[PDB]
Amino acid sequence: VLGYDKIFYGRKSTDVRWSADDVRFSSQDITFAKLGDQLHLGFDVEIFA
């Protein structure tokens, strides 16, 4: 996505988003700052960009 705040690739959720879609996102939030290229190796599709 592009935005005024940032040029950024968000979570880009997949499958069924449920109450646990929130807690599913928090992991990728830290992964944005992870830079280690490993992290959770998310099966839920996402992009850092």
């Binding site: 005024y4 705040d5 928090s26 939030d29 830290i30």
Partner: protein
């Protein structure tokens, strides 16, 4: 006077029971150990049952030489009381009367916002987790104690 396998000492000399005491010959029994009465009762933990001697069932006889105690005890999160924080601070729960908000009615750009980080376990002392282990004992009467063999 001094029966089989003496309970004995000396406070001063270099040598065994042969040179100083002169009757018999000695060695230090309980080196670094601190003597305690072995009662006929087997219970009181470091006063109780031998840390050398024990049955093949585990039963140490009421008996002596048994060991207890050690230098440095360390503080692990099994050791701590309950506690409270020292102020009113906002913890994270679903009855809450304060709603962080779903999303920003925020037409502007640079009016200062925060990122209140993800609600998680609130971490104390994780810089030093294992840290200091205080000394568990009392000041030493410690002197080279040569216990006459027999």
């Amino acid at each position: 006077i001094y029966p089989i396998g003496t309970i004995y000492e000396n406070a001063v000399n270099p040598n065994n029971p042969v040179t100083y005491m002169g009757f018999g010959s000695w060695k230090l029994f309980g080196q670094g150990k601190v003597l305690v009465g072995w009662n006929e009762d087997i219970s009181d933990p470091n006063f109780a049952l031998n840390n050398n001697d024990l049955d093949s069932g585990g039963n140490p006889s009421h008996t002596a030489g048994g060991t207890g105690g050690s230098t440095s005890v360390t503080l692990e999160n099994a050791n701590l009381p309950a506690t409270e924080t020292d102020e009113e601070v906002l913890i994270v729960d679903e009855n809450g009367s304060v709603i962080v908000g779903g999303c920003q009615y925020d037409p502007d750009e640079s009016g200062p916002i925060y990122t209140k980080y993800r609600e998680a376990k609130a971490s104390t002392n994780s810089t030093h987790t294992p840290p200091t282990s205080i000394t568990n004992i009392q000041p030493y009467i410690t002197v080279y104690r040569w216990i006459r063999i027999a």
